[PDB]
Amino acid sequence: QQLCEQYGYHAANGYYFNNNMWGQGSGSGSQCLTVDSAQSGGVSWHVDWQWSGGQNNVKSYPYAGRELPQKRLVSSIGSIPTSASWGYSGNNLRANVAYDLFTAADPNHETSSGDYELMIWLGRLGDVYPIGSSVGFVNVGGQQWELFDGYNGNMHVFSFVAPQQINNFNTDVKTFFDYLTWNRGFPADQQHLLILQFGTEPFTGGPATFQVNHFSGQVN
């Protein structure tokens, strides 16, 4: 499946993919997401892109996501085992590589995509910035991260950013949720987990390829 249109979309075997060129209007370029494998044990895919303009504007967030038929209360989730293997190539890369999760208390959350957004940046290429401000370094699930805290509209956004790129990553994402409820006031018995996604936010550069050798994730 080759997904070049702005919102070309594929789903199979419990995973979905979206080219997700939502910011294409803030610059110029092209992008195609190709699905290499989509199985119940995990997915494989890559996206090719070239992007220019809008120096500090995200052009897209191509991703694969785990299908979540029930939106579970974080306090009800035993674990979120996930595994990711990726690589980047191309010139002048300004992009990140990140897990993206969203939670909300009501299903009809009106003015935003979720009460909370939780990102985990495995990659940070070039001078690119998460939302909010640094609150320092924290240790979660066997790794040290720079935690960013901020708001994107109504949404409270927590970004755990790896100080050097992590190309092969295994964790339980519930431990990041635990960190947030023990230390940053996250209300675990009110927020339902809406989304578990993984991909790349390009800003500028290319011709580039973000290669996902393997992604898997579950909400248990």
Taking a C-beta distance cutoff of 8 angstroms, is the pair 108, 148 a contact?
Answer: no
Dihedral angle of Cα 88, 89, 94, 98, to the nearest 10 degrees: -10
Residue 8 Cα distances to 11, 84, 195, angstroms: 11, 22, 18
Give the method used: X-ray
- Strand 168-172 relative to strand 81-90, pairing: antiparallel
Chain-centroid distance of CA 128 in Å reads 15
Number of H helices, E strands in the chain: 1, 14
Please name the amino acid found at residue 155: M
Q: Can you give the resolution of this entry in Å? A: 2.1
Domain ranges for the chain: 1-220
Residue of 13, 60, 64, 59 whose CA lies nearest to 34 = 64
- Number of CB atoms found within 10 A of residue 186's CB: 21
For 181, the enclosing helix (H) or strand (E) is: helix 174-183
Q: What's the fold here for domain 1-220?
A: Jelly Rolls (2.60.120)
Helix (H, G, I), strand (E, B) or coil at 172: strand
Which DSSP letter does residue 153 get? Answer: T
Residue of 173, 172, 189 whose CA lies nearest to 181 = 189
Please name the amino acid found at residue 72: R
Residues with a catalytic annotation lie at 117, 201
